[PDB]
């Protein structure tokens, strides 16, 4: 009886569902009027299980939105198993131009075409039959179901895919990075904004994680072979200053803004995953550092071929070109996130801002000791001036020289360094390579003139055992003199505030050194109580 009538209903629910579970191709979206059919289709399933959820008073859990959602995630894993046994055929009728078969282990073509057959798929779900099935708005969203079914079942070939690729590397890694780009737009224009989803971190990225990592490698090894063919462009070139502004040559600009195209590439992928964009940065600071590193090693292998009176401008480029190094490093440590980088990462930058400082403080050393031969041989020159400084007032000449005259000429030796250069070094130097240079050739001079005009005395055999000697005053005027000529070269540094600051000169223990020196031929001037 009733019995007869429950069947009944089985039999065509049962019925509805099959046609359902291939709705795609049962109303295919090119048909209005089948469109129209299908709507009509799950309106009567509504109907009927709205019927036996009432007179049925048994609890009915077939809910019609389950129901046609179950529908349509069936007819979606058919729909995904067509188009992939159908990827190159579907492909070449519609998105083509001039012209095994599906998964390929020697190329990555079969999955980019893959990837535009899923996006018709829920382009279409979005576009047809979304709006068709508007029974249950807020549980059947036959687009969002199709980004969700078909992204999964693409999830999991594409991840046994790459695993098989790791393993064997048959393709240029520009494929798999620009596969690891184009299955980044699909994951976030379709999925990433998915309940499913829209929490925890995506696992698509460690799919491709082995392969960046090798195009990471080959990427240093490119940057390095443009590394060098940049700075034979520029020596051929002669290290021109880019500009009259600009303190640096040519192949400074060339080493960053490549360093730079590659690490935008990595920023394109917007990785996801915060433990994989670490190991990608902690990868590219090593390249960083090598390409870098390379740069300041071969400036130090050539830096004192160009140390002489020819070309004195180029040695200071290079000085400059060092020390542009150091600031837009730091403007690249910014971009790959400042203090939000990764630990190893920023320590291998870090690590490499001190190594790249210690350069060029050898490097300034180097371009001082370019002058210690000439300057020897001005401290000797205005030590024999100083030798002929003796008082000539005792009788009333007129004609005699003043302590300050005396100075000057005791300096002028020395002093065609100071304009001929030091008005040429802060013309062309970085402040802060400036500042190096002159701490060093200070010192150079304080040097120097502790060995030549003091003239230390010497040891000699008195009875048993050598003695020094007692130091040889200067007279009271040459006391005069070389205390003026030192406090003279000091004001030179200072250069009012273009040079050292005051408070280093003062402190400087080569100075301290000197003076020390001075004092055991200073003793006729020299106060007991300061």
């Given at each position: 009886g009733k019995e007869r009538f429950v069947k009944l209903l089985d039999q065509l629910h049962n019925s509805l569902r099959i046609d359902l579970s291939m709705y795609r191709n049962?109303?295919?979206?090119?048909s209005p009027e089948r469109l129209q059919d299908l709507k009509s289709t799950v309106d009567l399933l509504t109907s009927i299980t709205f019927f036996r959820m009432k007179?049925?008073?048994?609890?009915?859990?077939?809910?019609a939105s389950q129901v046609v959602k179950d529908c349509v995630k069936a007819c979606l894993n058919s729909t995904y198993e067509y188009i992939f046994n159908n990827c190159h055929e579907l492909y070449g009728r519609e998105y083509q131009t001039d012209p095994e078969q599906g998964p390929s282990i020697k190329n990555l073509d079969f999955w980019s075409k893959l990837i535009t057959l899923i996006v018709s798929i829920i382009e279409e779900d979005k576009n047809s039959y979304t709006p068709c099935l508007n029974q249950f708005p807020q549980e059947l969203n036959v687009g969002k179901i199709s980004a969700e079914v078909m992204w999964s079942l693409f999830a999991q070939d594409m991840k046994y895919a790459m695993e098989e690729h790791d393993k064997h590397?048959?393709?240029?890694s520009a494929d798999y990075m620009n596969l690891h780009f184009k299955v980044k737009w699909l994951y976030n224009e379709y999925?990433?904004?998915?309940?499913?989803?829209?929490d925890r971190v995506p696992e698509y990225p460690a799919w491709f994680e082995p392969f960046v990592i090798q195009w990471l490698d080959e990427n240093e090894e490119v940057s390095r072979d443009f590394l060098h063919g940049a700075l034979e462009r520029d020596k051929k070139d002669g290290?021109?200053?880019?500009?009259?502004?600009?303190?640096?040559?040519?192949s400074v600009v060339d080493v960053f803004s490549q360093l730079n195209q590659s690490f935008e590439i990595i920023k394109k992928?917007?990785?996801?995953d915060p433990q994989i964009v670490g190991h990608y940065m902690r990868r590219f600071a090593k390249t960083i550092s090598n390409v870098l590193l390379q740069y300041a090693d071969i400036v130090s292998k050539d830096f004192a071929s160009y140390?002489?009176?020819?070309?004195?401008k180029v040695p200071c480029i290079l000085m400059n070109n060092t020390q542009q190094l150091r600031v837009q490093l730091e403007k690249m440590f910014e971009a790959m996130?400042?203090?939000?980088?990764?630990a190893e990462a920023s320590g291998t930058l870090k690590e490499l801002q001190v190594k790249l400082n210690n350069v060029l403080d050898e490097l300034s050393h180097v371009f001082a000791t370019s002058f210690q031969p000439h300057i020897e041989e001005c401290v000797r020159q205005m030590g024999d001036i100083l030798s002929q400084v003796?008082?000539?007032?005792?009788?009333?000449?007129?004609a005699c020289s003043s302590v300050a005259q005396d100075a000057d000429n005791v300096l002028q030796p020395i002093m065609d360094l100071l304009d001929s250069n030091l008005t040429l070094f802060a013309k062309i130097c970085e402040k802060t390579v400036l500042k190096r240079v002159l701490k060093e050739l200070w010192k150079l001079v304080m040097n120097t003139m502790e060995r030549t005009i003091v003239l230390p005395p010497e040891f000699s055999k008195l009875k048993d055992h050598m003695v020094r000697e007692e130091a040889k005053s200067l007279t009271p005027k040459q006391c005069a003199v070389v205390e003026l000529a030192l406090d003279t070269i000091k004001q030179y540094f200072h250069a009012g505030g273009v040079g050292l600051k005051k408070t280093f000169l003062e402190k400087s223990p080569d100075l301290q050194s000197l003076r020390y020196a001075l004092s055991l031929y200073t003793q006729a001037t020299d106060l007991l109580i300061k």
């Open positions: 049962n109303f295919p979206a090119s007179v049925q008073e048994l609890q009915s859990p077939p809910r590397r048959l393709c240029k999925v990433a904004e998915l309940p499913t989803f829209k290290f021109q200053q880019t500009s009259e502004h600009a303190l640096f040559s040519c992928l917007e990785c996801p140390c002489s009176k020819e070309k004195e996130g400042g203090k939000e980088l990764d003796k008082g000539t007032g005792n009788v009333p000449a007129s």
